RNA sequence: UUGGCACCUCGAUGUCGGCUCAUCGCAUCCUGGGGCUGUAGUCGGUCCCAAGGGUUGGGCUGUUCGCCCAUUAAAGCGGUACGCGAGCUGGGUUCAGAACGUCGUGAGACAGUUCGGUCCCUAUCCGUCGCGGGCGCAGGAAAUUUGAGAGGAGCUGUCCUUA
RNA sequence: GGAUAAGUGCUGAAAGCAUCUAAGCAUGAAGCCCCCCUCAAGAUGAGAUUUCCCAUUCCGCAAGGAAGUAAGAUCCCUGAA
């Protein structure tokens, strides 16, 4: 008969900077913060994560070929509506939302996966408009 | 870049220097004005916007008196809003007239279809037509919908529904004449839209 | 038996710069250069005389090694003397000329053809139909002499078309 | 080209190589020229 | 494809061809870009990359297929229950009539032929195309807008000059 | 326009040479992303800009609720582009 937590929380912001990591080894920490199981108090079923911030996005790195030969798809509900776009120009154009696809892929699927998702909050850059939320580094073990 | 808007009144002939006729589409633009004119470091974009009637103050509202007051003009009723065009040179209360334009300028027209209601395949997508005759108890009809292992419909498939009432821009018109006194535009050719409608004129996007 | 087990001797109008880790420049009466390597290597300028290293034997560090040297002797080679690279051509209406420092051609095509050498090339027309690609970098050098190369590539029936002074054409029998 | 995969050389002259993880022959003869495909 | 096996379906999974509607693959018919040539040129052959778009109208036959006429840049190969019958037709196959040949003692029979022969269903759900209402978007309102993102379009000849 | 396919290459070693390749550079298609046209903030990540309204009254300890309104919109009516 232990505790199972209910608006007993206390969300903290984290930082992280991106400046040479592997987007995968990075994401499966996140994530795993994002829900909940780096605290003591963790329950499946309330999101006791921690508010994240991620900066310098385009400064990810990868292994191997991939940003010649990683391919994220993506097809429409249109008959010959899928499109392709490749690692680089994805970090190029825009490295938010493939390192949002790549955590959100790792997040658990439901509302409460949608909601813990809902807390991240990734930057290009090292901009950070989240000065008012008085946010502390996370280093990562990996 | 440049651009104006007025209103559709109708067509007719016109000659050439020649007997060569010319398909003309007459429009007024009673002279045009500015409102407003944005930035990139406020609004995220270079643009400006434009006016184009003169309202009567019991159809018009206060929040549209004052975002004209700004300028020293009436409210207005068909504004829109230009983009990638000098905006050093333009101003607020600024008019704008066909004068900008000459005879031989090329243009974008853009406005409204018309309204054609909820019609059929046919008409609204150019299909053919199962035959008359022969036993056929099919015509005036679609088609098949599709295949059968996906057990669904696929989307794009066409169907009747309310045709018209689009935004519809024609490319590379060519103006014929002006007549700045009664603030006229005469194009070669024929525009979307009904009599009475909004038209915005452009610059040619060569 | 190997290339960047060598060294390159610095004769003299020569400056040669570590800017930093690997950032060669160098300078002279031709003009200046200046290279990044890969930083595993290792470089060491004595009196006169450059020497070149690697930490290990693989098949990067291998071809590193003679790369290096390679290619800094063309560096100091450039500097000191410069390249140089010819051009023939063979035809009848075949001929070329110069608008100011541009290249212009007369070949074979209704139009003519211009090139521009932009990067601190020059180009020299002792003849109507000799051509001379004349700077400092072998890379850049032909690369601007395939550029015109490819113009109007030879033909192997007639030999026609561009041509470097030292090429052997293939042959064809016209029927 | 000759694209094959029984990729050989033909004259002494010919010489095999290796480019982009592919396998190719040269020879000044352009008919001995080969790749895998 | 012809097939083999009999696994779902005989308390019913409608079966050829055609019409309308398209859609996908590429082992590409054309168009584009190249290598080689027993490529002089013009035309070509073959191979490679490319599926964006396009890829005819008639006669005969129920026909598919195929032959033929005339064109075209070309007149592609296939899949989608040999796509699509609660979307159409129903000419053929494949009910009952009758007939020819043939077989059978005969009743009758023939992937032999011929003539003629009822194609039902008010769309509940999903899906698709259009259209409205409600609420939301940390106050309530009128306007203009950004653009994530989606869809569309995307073909080609002939002539003149170069000559 | 940008990046690419096949292809072409420059420089260049491993492999004293040669080599379009491993480092490094550039070209190169009706194709890919754009440029063109249309829809588009339910993009619940619900955006931005301009302008208008004011911060009233009753309870209710507060929480909050209703009950008249402003700007504005509608019911209703004349009609159609």
Known sequence: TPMANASTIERKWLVVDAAGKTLGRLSSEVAAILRGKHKPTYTPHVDTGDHVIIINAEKIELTGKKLTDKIYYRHTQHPGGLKSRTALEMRTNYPEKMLELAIKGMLPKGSLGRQMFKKLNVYRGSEHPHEAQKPEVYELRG | ?206 | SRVGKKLLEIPSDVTVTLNDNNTVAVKGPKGELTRTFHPDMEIKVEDNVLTVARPSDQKEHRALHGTTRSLLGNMVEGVSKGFERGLELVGVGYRASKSGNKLVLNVGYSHPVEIVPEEGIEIEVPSQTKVVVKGTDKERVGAIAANIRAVRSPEPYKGKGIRYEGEVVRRKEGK | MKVRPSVKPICEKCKVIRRKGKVMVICENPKHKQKQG
Not at chain 2, 84 to 109: L, N, P, R, T
Not at chain 2, 110 to 120: A, E, H, R, W, Y
């Open chain 2, 1 to 206: 870049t440049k651009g104006i808007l007025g209103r559709k009144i109708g067509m007719t002939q016109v000659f050439a220097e020649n007997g060569d006729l010319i398909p003309v589409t007459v429009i007024e633009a009673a002279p045009n004005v500015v409102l407003q004119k944005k930035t990139a470091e406020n609004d995220g974009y270079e643009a400006i916007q434009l006016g184009f009637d003169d309202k009567r103050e019991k159809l018009s509202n206060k929040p549209e008196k004052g975002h004209v007051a700004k300028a020293e003009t009436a409210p207005k009723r068909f504004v829109k809003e230009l983009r990638g065009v000098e905006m050093d040179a333009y101003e607020v209360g600024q008019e704008v007239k066909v004068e900008i334009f000459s005879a031989g300028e090329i243009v974008d027209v853009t406005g409204v279809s018309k309204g054609k209601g909820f019609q059929g395949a046919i008409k609204r997508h150019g299909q053919s037509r199962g035959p008359m005759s022969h036993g056929s108890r099919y015509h005036r009809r679609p088609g098949s919908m599709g295949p059968v292992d996906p057990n669904r419909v696929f989307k794009g498939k066409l169907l009747p529904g309310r045709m018209g009432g689009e935004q519809i821009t024609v490319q590379n018109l060519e103006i014929v004449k002006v007549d700045a006194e009664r603030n006229l535009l005469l194009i070669k050719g024929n525009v979307p839209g009904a009599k009475k409608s909004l038209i915005t004129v452009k610059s040619a996007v060569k």
